[PDB]
């Protein structure tokens, strides 16, 4: 999969989409639909479907929803307030977690200002907490902005 601070973005396009194989697969731990209840998806047509992908903790799946707050929805991935799609989530302990700790899945924990909806930020500048210029070096009130 893809990190949480640089999510992916696939633009599904002209095709025959069958959201029933999704809806009834029973392998998903969370399948919420917001603009439109799930059973009526296989009876409507749009212009574009986007699919974003990433990996988070287990109890941060409640911040992937319109109108939430927290380190994920504030500055990692923000959903607009009139969302239309659906959110799907499933546990993946056996694939992504490895003995000794899988330190390849990072997230951003400091930013100047919360994200605009569907905005993305992969920069890696030293977060300047204190007025003292960080000069690009760590220290008190000068923090690296990514945690794992």
């Amino acid at each position, epitope marked *: 999969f893809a990190s949480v601070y640089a999510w992916n973005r696939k633009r599904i396009s002209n095709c025959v989409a069958d959201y029933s194989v999704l809806y009834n697969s029973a392998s998903f731990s969370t399948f919420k639909c917001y603009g439109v209840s799930p059973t009526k998806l296989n009876d409507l047509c749009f212009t574009n479907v986007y699919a974003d992908s990433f990996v988070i903790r287990g109890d941060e799946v409640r911040q992937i929803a319109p109108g939430q707050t927290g380190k994920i929805a504030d500055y990692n991935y923000k959903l607009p307030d009139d969302f239309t799609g659906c959110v799907i989530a499933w546990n993946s302990n056996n694939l992504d977690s490895k003995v000794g700790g899988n330190y390849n899945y990072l997230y951003r924990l400091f930013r100047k200002s919360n994200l605009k909806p569907f905005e993305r930020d992969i920069s890696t500048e030293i977060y300047q907490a204190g007025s003292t210029p960080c000069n690009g070096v*760590e220290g008190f009130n000068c923090y690296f902005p990514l945690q794992s």
Partner: antibody
Amino acid sequence: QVQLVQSGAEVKKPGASVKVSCKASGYTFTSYDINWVRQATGQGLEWMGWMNPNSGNTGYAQKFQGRVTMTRNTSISTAYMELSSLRSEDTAVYYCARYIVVVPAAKGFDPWGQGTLVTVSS
Amino acid sequence: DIVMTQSPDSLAVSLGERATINCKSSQSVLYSSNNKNYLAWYQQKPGQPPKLLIYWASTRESGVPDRFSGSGSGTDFTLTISSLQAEDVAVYYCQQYYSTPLTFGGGTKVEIKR
């Protein structure tokens, strides 16, 4: 959970060396700077912040220099402190704290070690 | 450099009173629009590790009831606990922030009536 566990309430003789441990839990560890303070019998505190999650250059308080050494282990996230050449008036209690931060600027120390004892005297 | 001289000491006054603990040195307003402050208030019970009280100087108490209440300015400020009650008897230090070290000293006890 948000915890800090110290150990090593002990006694030393002057002109010696000591290592003191702080065990952490309930956090990513390498993400918040560890800061130790001194405290005599009914007095104030000192020792400026230092050390960081990754590598960390580490700082000092400029009257404690040379005797002070800060070593940790990425095996569980346990910060330590090595003092040397004790002079039998550094007998005090020694603390740990996580120094938590939040968007704007960190706000005081997150937790607070349980403290420890070092008693120097022949 | 920045010395946090606290004036009052042993405010052993009848519970409920309104203590006023002042201290200052060498302002730390801290630019960056973040015009807030730079120093927390602390509470250390005797025979106990310290705890956290008002920070940013900005009343920002955490799991802490309202009677403990801060204030702030550029150089000078005060903690000012209201309606004090039994078990607030402690030692109350200050901070410095970007400075380096710390500095503070205060406490209370009782007074009685007789």
